[PDB]
Amino acid sequence: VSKLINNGLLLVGQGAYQDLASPQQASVEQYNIIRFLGGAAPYIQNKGFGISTDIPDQCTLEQVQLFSRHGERYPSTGSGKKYKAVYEKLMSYNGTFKGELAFLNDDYEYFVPDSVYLEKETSPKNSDSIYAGTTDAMKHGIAFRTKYGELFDTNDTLPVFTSNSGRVYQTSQYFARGFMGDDFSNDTVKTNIISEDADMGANSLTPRDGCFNYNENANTAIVDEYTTEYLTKALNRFKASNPGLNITEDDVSNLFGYCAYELNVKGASPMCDIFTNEEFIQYSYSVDLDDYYSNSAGNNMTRVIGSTLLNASLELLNHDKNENKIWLSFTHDTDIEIFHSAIGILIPDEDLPVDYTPFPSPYSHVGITPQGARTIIEKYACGNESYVRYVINDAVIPIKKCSSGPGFSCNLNDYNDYVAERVAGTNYVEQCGNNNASAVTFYWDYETTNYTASLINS
Amino acid sequence: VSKLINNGLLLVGQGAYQDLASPQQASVEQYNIIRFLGGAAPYIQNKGFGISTDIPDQCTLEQVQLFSRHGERYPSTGSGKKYKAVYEKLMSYNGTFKGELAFLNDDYEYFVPDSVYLEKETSPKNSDSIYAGTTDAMKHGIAFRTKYGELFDTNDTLPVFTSNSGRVYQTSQYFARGFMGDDFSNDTVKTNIISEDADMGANSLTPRDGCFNYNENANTAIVDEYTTEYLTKALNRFKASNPGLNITEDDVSNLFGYCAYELNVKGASPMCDIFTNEEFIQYSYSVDLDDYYSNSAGNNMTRVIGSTLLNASLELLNHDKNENKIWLSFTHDTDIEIFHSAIGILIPDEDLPVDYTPFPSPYSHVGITPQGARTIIEKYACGNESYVRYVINDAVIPIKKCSSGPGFSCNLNDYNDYVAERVAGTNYVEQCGNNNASAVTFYWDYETTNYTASLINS
Amino acid sequence: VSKLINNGLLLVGQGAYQDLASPQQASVEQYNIIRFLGGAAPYIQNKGFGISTDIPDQCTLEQVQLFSRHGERYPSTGSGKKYKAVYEKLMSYNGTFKGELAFLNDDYEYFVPDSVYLEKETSPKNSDSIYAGTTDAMKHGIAFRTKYGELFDTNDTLPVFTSNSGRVYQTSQYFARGFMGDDFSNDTVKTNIISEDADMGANSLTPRDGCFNYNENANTAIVDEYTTEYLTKALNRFKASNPGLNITEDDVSNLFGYCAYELNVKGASPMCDIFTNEEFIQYSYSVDLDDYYSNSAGNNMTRVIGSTLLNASLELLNHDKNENKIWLSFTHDTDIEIFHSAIGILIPDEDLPVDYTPFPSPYSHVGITPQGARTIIEKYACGNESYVRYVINDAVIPIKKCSSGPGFSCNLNDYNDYVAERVAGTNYVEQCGNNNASAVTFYWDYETTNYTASLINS
Amino acid sequence: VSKLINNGLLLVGQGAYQDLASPQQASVEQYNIIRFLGGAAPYIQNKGFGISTDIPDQCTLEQVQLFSRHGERYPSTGSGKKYKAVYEKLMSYNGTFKGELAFLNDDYEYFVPDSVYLEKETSPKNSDSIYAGTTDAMKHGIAFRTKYGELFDTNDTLPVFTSNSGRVYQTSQYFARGFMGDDFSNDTVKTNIISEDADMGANSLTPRDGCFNYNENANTAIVDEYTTEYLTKALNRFKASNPGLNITEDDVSNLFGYCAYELNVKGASPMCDIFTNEEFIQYSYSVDLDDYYSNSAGNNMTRVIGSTLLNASLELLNHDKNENKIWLSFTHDTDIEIFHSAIGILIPDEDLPVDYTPFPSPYSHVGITPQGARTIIEKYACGNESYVRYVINDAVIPIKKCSSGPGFSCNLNDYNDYVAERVAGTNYVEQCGNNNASAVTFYWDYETTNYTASLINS
Ligand SMILES: *[C@@H]1O[C@H](CO)[C@@H](O)[C@H](O)[C@H]1NC(C)=O
Ligand SMILES: *[C@@H]1O[C@H](CO)[C@@H](O)[C@H](O)[C@H]1NC(C)=O
Ligand SMILES: *[C@@H]1O[C@H](CO)[C@@H](O)[C@H](O)[C@H]1NC(C)=O
Ligand SMILES: *[C@@H]1O[C@H](CO)[C@@H](O)[C@H](O)[C@H]1NC(C)=O
Ligand SMILES: *[C@@H]1O[C@H](CO)[C@@H](O)[C@H](O)[C@H]1NC(C)=O
Ligand SMILES: *[C@@H]1O[C@H](CO)[C@@H](O)[C@H](O)[C@H]1NC(C)=O
Ligand SMILES: *[C@@H]1O[C@H](CO)[C@@H](O)[C@H](O)[C@H]1NC(C)=O
Ligand SMILES: *[C@@H]1O[C@H](CO)[C@@H](O)[C@H](O)[C@H]1NC(C)=O
Ligand SMILES: *[C@@H]1O[C@H](CO)[C@@H](O)[C@H](O)[C@H]1NC(C)=O
Ligand SMILES: *[C@@H]1O[C@H](CO)[C@@H](O)[C@H](O)[C@H]1NC(C)=O
């Protein structure tokens, strides 16, 4: 395939630049396909606000907390089944594909040829893609040591906190290897594998698993009211070039995710080429809708689940005497998204509408959890005060009305009040129905508790 | 001066890319200096939403309206003279400048050589800047012809509507020249210069001029509540390196515009180097506040004023049969802002806060009126329906709840209801206290009325 | 068509960046398709040597000479015929195209639907392409006034020198309009249209036309020895996906130019997608070969033709008292290429080989004459000396062993000796067999001689 | 310090784009500062020729050899101490620095905090630079696995060959770690540390060490003929702004390396801002000259020395049946340069001139050995033939007259003839005067010879 086809991520051409003095006068980031793929496609930085991510001058790093998703991965078992099916449905067309689907004629292989890769991080070992998730995680580890490394005492073991999802675990490991470089060994790094079982309660990197009363589908109804007409138009366009083509809107909907994962896996996907920006945007909003209403503030149970890690993170912030200053936590998009429902920095004031497409989406799921998502809390001293701020996918995201400190940070005293108010009236044990652990302890007790859950293939 | 210094517009270096597979995974556009300079600095495209600006497939162009600001300019008289005063205060420091202000020692000339350039477009003739306002307008005209020229009948004169401001008028001419290329002549283009005189009432590209009850400064005390502490900190930093340096917070505040203008004029400004991102962002928000409360929905009078052009534009869209399909109007940022107060697509639901810095700014002045600002309405037919949409600084901005047409456009029928809602209860004559023209007629009566005001230097 | 397809010019993907800290560590320019299209595709800057194109500090601009090709154009009459034929040959395939050629099924229109555009500059009026040649020329004019404008006395008419090729003429005009801005009129610009008739002799912007003894095909034999096997491999690949496909290597060869012009005309060409880099590179070298041996030092008659303009240019350089300091000449690639055979700055020491592909090509035709090619001679004073240097497609190209002056320039005294040696033993009248004008005079006599040749459609 | 200053590597601003339709029409890579810093500054990819670095379609990887320099490093002892001496001369200026040297006033620290870092790779651990040498090596390993890993059998140990230089050795380990990812261990990788001791003779990654008749300084008097006038001019400029500043031309010459090293160490260097492009280019050529005459074909001894690795590499390509297909060798720039003296693909036909500055430099040292230099031989099968080609710093560099295979590769049969031609009449023992090992055996006998030299700080 020509290097002129699918050789980048931008759904815009050179036309963007045609009347500019400088290419820097152009706004082309908006057209990045990843932003429309619901967090399934490769890592992308948050749009951000222009705030420098450097620690401000005259401030000194006190502590950092990373909450990271796994890196890019193969489809899940469930999705893989869907994509393999739609591939088989497509391939069983009797006819030669024309138009956007013409690539389907060209000895087009299914991008997951071995199902053992389903659920796995893409890596140099199983993928030819530059967007390999383990690569993402290693490069992140490196970058992260570069920036926050002065907080690391090399006489200390680096603790790593990870759920037992194999891909989350492998992320944590590639991250730690990036961070530690040629000092990485079984002795300089201790990984605490925190089980996803419901019996971990709030003592978890996936506290939703112990929250029995949380129904992620509490709002599927409202989400289903959002138009799917773009799926029909697209299906109809495919049929116009391919008469008799037997696929549905359901098949078409699956092809956005198919695009995202083939991109992850192969580094380029012809499946990405079949949709217009406008279809991408509507697909994207249907994902924001789904995630907002399942995983964020649209679901009235995410505050309480999200607060477990908000609390623990705040405890870490408040304890300045801990020898360890670097908190490395790895988990899933959903956990990070629910954590964000409690953080409250990327959460809209009102529930998302379904009767129109809002611009922008008041809730951007990919701005919070792309593949390789990173939610970082920086703590630093400036004079006689400590300040806290969030760096979400490499953008500083100021806490609303707590952004007066250097780098639009929140005085730790004010951050205390902010968190208090976010978590007011939450009670995990009681709202969730789970009498296991009521709070996170694993950041503190991992030396005396063995977090060695075995890895699951999810 | 090293080509490594001020060789671009981005307030970020290469660290943005350091853990990515592709540079397209980076979000660096948030860091563009222009976005913090309040519309004073060169043109920049609206961040946008990824909507293809192309006319959608199966859609046929019917009409386009352009509402354009003048291009990049030299400082106005007031600002220029304020910049000259600050320059002179700096030059009379006795001492060698150190730190960020050191460039002041280096035969640093004031950037406006001749005060005759105040108020004027920068151009190849008066400026060595690639960011020249006339270049921007000319390239825009070319691009605009390339996009919309199928709508132009070459047997017909191109009408141009411009206010009689020199810079605005010159913009219109460079644009028309870009548009018409080697067909440009006093025969193929007829420019209607619409006076900024208050006696023009609503029949004006600057209807605020005839609005007597409009007080742009009505909300200054609110606006002035916003923090100036960053100015003090910046000043103290300058003083720390330059003991006894005698300038004010007011001076420092003017150095932002000085930066924006020296950038326009010279193509680079050492003065841009003296601020942190955090200062630019607060500066930027002070401008958003001032313009929101003066020129937008913060001021109760702007909806009535803005509605004059909104109505006129709607009359144009409603009228199928006009031989002329390309509307080209040139005016100031203020008029376009007030216009947008009535358009209502880039207007926040609520008044801007003053007691903290919101992220993002709920009202982005530079998203609407950068130098060389362009507000475009495209009208196109898809099937048996006509659709309208806005392209503001090269980004489609869908109308809230009127964006289900192709390319997120509004059915002209629905667009009628939207406009009616926007202009409801407005009355120029009565609200403004002006009994001259009550409505725009210049788009229709310009062949019988001689619109030929003499140019003013403002 | 997806904005992920053909949305740039680079025959490389994101893979180039995958192991870098900064995207600026990547070399991706080498992959620009334009460089392989033999000067037929849009303008591209010369690779260059990193030499700043600014006039050095402490130097002051004395004089500038532009020798410019026309901008991007539609195919010629001859080429158009070839491309239309290959399109018709392709379209008459009975079968559905598969593979690279699949786009041929998709209601693929021939990109020159009206033959009146053959030979013409692409423009906003006849083309949707951002690469419109008139746009290129206008933007150049603007840029050129920005840089060299201090040499322009606005009390003077700008003289423009152009051959009577309609597209060259139109280039000169769009250039002059860019340069003059809103001061462009019949009075501020005087265009001297220099006939391409053989009877102009050396008094010509196309002195090859008066050189009867010049045989551009003196070396076709050696050029034909260069491998064409890549054409077979490509043809075979097309046939493998399309059994029965009746096209030849001749057809395939025509498709590189078809790619180049559809790119010019439409801004993107699916025809560009059918070749590998390796085919592009070999096509490209066959063009370098052809042009080197026809138009440059491989042909023993180009020195003498090239010296006519080298001499005239040098005369202009030596006459510091001329009121006019800006020499604007427009002509064809071949004339500029032959001029370069005499200039000697981009000419290899040995003739090009044909029995292998050399890397790099010792003679890069597209580095000298892309569409919109610009060969500029800058003259500037530094202290008590004047210096001369070449800026070829926006890159400074130092004269070998005359690059000691500021900006790697040649002292005008040394430049005199350099030109003397380049033109030693040339005699246009005698070597060419033409007893018309023996030397260029039109730079000096255009006020008293009327250069108003009528425009030809070539 | 402003993010507008030193925020990139390019010695050009936005003016490069000002008359283009697409920024991809610009040639800005010529302006990269790295290309003028003589291999001292961060990694940069070879400018290259547009050849796709992908394995050609229908070709199957058979073998790869990597010859890698150490990554970016701190200054060597000598250079570091020279930089410290210049820093101290500058700091003892009594006076406030003005002009380009003003940053010297701003609590400007010397960039090597601890002399223990001299000779060492920059890494996340000792450096906050994105350009860290270890990061570069690690990312390279990842990329290399992604490209070549189909050739790796995971049942087999990965052998690594490195010299015992600390920085080289560390490079090899970061690379291997990138390559092996979470499979890296002392079991999956076996590193063979090949001593730099002269007693190693030709069985060495640094065979120049055992070559007694090799005088790297044989040609210093030739090299010293090249102009130093630019140093005087630079110095006089520094003096003009700083009266009585007491530094030499020698000092100024060292400030180029200081720039390169501070860039490596800090990620930005104010010292890079003190030179013009024209000075960097002359500096750059002084380094090309020195290295051409010391480490390449300018020195009569390098072909014999280089031929040791050329022969060994050829023995590897000739031997189909080795279970190991991935050769990873790590050594210094000097060894790779001398290697290239025998490879002969980036070697000029003639000795470099000294009496002027050629464009381009006929021998580009940084094109061969930037920090993190990579010379790769790929061997792949196309049909019943095997092909060999070179990828130097991410660019395919075809062998002259052996580039007609797919991807401009050389049939291994032809490659044998090429190598034989290159090594003809060479004899290490006799030409070098060293009777220790006469040939490389370490690639074959490393499982029976213990290659385990102790690390040196050089
Ligand atoms: C390093 O860690 C050990 C074991 O935790 C501790 O006892 C010792 O105090 C530490 N050494 C230094 C130099 O900090
Ligand atoms: C914790 O959760 C697990 C799984 O739901 C359950 O078996 C156990 O009873 C719980 N423990 C308590 C004390 O509720
Ligand atoms: C968070 O901590 C507060 C105490 O500050 C507590 O009342 C609340 O239950 C906690 N929320 C969760 C879900 O852990
Ligand atoms: C806009 O038009 C409406 C009727 O559509 C009219 O009643 C109203 O006064 C107009 N507003 C202005 C301010 O021109
Ligand atoms: C129109 O505007 C003028 C100038 O401001 C004002 O003085 C006059 O009263 C107005 N005329 C009418 C008819 O209201
Ligand atoms: C302008 O040009 C005219 C006519 O060529 C000439 O006579 C006059 O001297 C010039 N005026 C100035 C101010 O240079
Ligand atoms: C000049 O050239 C033309 C065309 O070739 C020819 O008719 C004429 O005779 C020539 N004049 C002389 C004096 O040779
Ligand atoms: C160039 O000028 C020289 C005189 O300097 C002359 O001998 C030669 O004929 C000229 N060459 C051409 C072709 O005009
Ligand atoms: C390279 O190998 C040849 C035989 O192929 C041998 O005669 C020659 O001496 C070798 N050169 C070196 C320097 O190892
Ligand atoms: C090998 O090299 C050593 C160390 O430089 C040298 O002294 C010795 O003579 C050599 N040995 C032989 C066998 O030539």
Side-chain angles (χ1 to χ4, degrees), chain D residues 5 8 35 44 63 108 130 132 134 152 174 185 197-198 207 231 266 287 301 327 329 335 359 361 390 409 417 432:
Chain D
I5 289 162
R35 291 226 190 65
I44 198 168
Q63 190 185 318
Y108 179 65
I130 69 166
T134 57
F152 180 62
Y174 271 88
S185 80
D197 290 347
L231 295 167
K266 303 294 291 192
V287 176
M301 283 307 292
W327 303 104
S329 300
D335 301 293
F359 291 89
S361 170
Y390 281 88
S409 57
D417 293 345
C432 291

Side-chain angles (χ1 to χ4, degrees), chain D residues 202 302-312 314-315 342 416 419-420 422-429 431-432 438-440:
Chain D
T302 60
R303 187 168 312 201
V304 64
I305 300 162
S307 294
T308 59
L309 291 176
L310 188 63
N311 279 349
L314 176 69
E315 292 184 36
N416 271 279
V419 176
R422 292 306 295 172
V423 308
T426 59
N427 178 347
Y428 189 83
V429 169
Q431 286 167 91
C432 291
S438 66
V440 164

Side-chain angles (χ1 to χ4, degrees), chain B residues 197-201 209-210 212 429 433-437:
Chain B
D197 290 347
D199 58 14
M200 287 303 276
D209 287 353
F212 302 129
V429 169
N434 189 337
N435 263 288
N436 295 274

Side-chain angles (χ1 to χ4, degrees), chain B residues 14 22 125 135 142 170 182, chain C residues 14 22 142 170 174 182-183:
Chain B
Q14 305 309 120
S22 173
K125 183 188 192 179
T135 296
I142 297 177
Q170 188 166 50
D182 67 358
Chain C
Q14 300 314 118
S22 171
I142 294 173
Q170 186 175 44
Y174 272 87
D182 65 0
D183 293 320

Side-chain angles (χ1 to χ4, degrees), chain C residues 249-363:
Chain C
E249 287 87 332
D250 294 338
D251 296 307
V252 176
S253 192
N254 289 330
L255 294 179
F256 296 88
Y258 190 116
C259 164
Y261 287 100
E262 183 168 41
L263 172 55
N264 290 354
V265 171
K266 311 291 284 173
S269 172
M271 208 56 81
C272 294
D273 307 332
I274 73 182
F275 296 117
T276 60
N277 288 31
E278 170 170 29
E279 287 158 351
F280 279 122
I281 287 163
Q282 288 164 101
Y283 175 79
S284 178
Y285 184 64
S286 76
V287 182
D288 285 349
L289 277 173
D290 193 39
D291 293 336
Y292 176 73
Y293 278 111
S294 319
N295 296 337
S296 186
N299 193 302
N300 60 22
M301 283 295 300
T302 62
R303 190 69 71 92
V304 56
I305 294 148
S307 296
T308 65
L309 290 167
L310 192 64
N311 282 348
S313 151
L314 176 63
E315 298 176 1
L316 291 165
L317 290 176
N318 285 158
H319 290 68
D320 51 277
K321 284 181 282 158
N322 198 319
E323 175 75 39
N324 180 71
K325 314 285 182 188
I326 298 172
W327 306 99
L328 307 177
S329 301
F330 303 81
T331 188
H332 291 97
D333 53 356
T334 300
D335 308 293
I336 288 172
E337 189 162 29
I338 289 165
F339 182 16
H340 269 271
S341 190
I343 300 171
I345 61 177
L346 288 166
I347 302 310
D349 303 304
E350 301 194 348
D351 282 356
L352 276 52
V354 300
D355 65 309
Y356 68 104
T357 309
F359 286 91
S361 167
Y363 178 70

Side-chain angles (χ1 to χ4, degrees), chain D residues 62-83:
Chain D
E62 289 177 301
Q63 190 185 318
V64 63
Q65 318 175 355
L66 170 63
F67 299 90
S68 174
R69 190 188 178 178
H70 54 78
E72 292 86 334
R73 49 153 178 95
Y74 275 86
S76 64
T77 302
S79 293
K81 289 192 169 185
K82 286 160 176 308
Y83 306 150

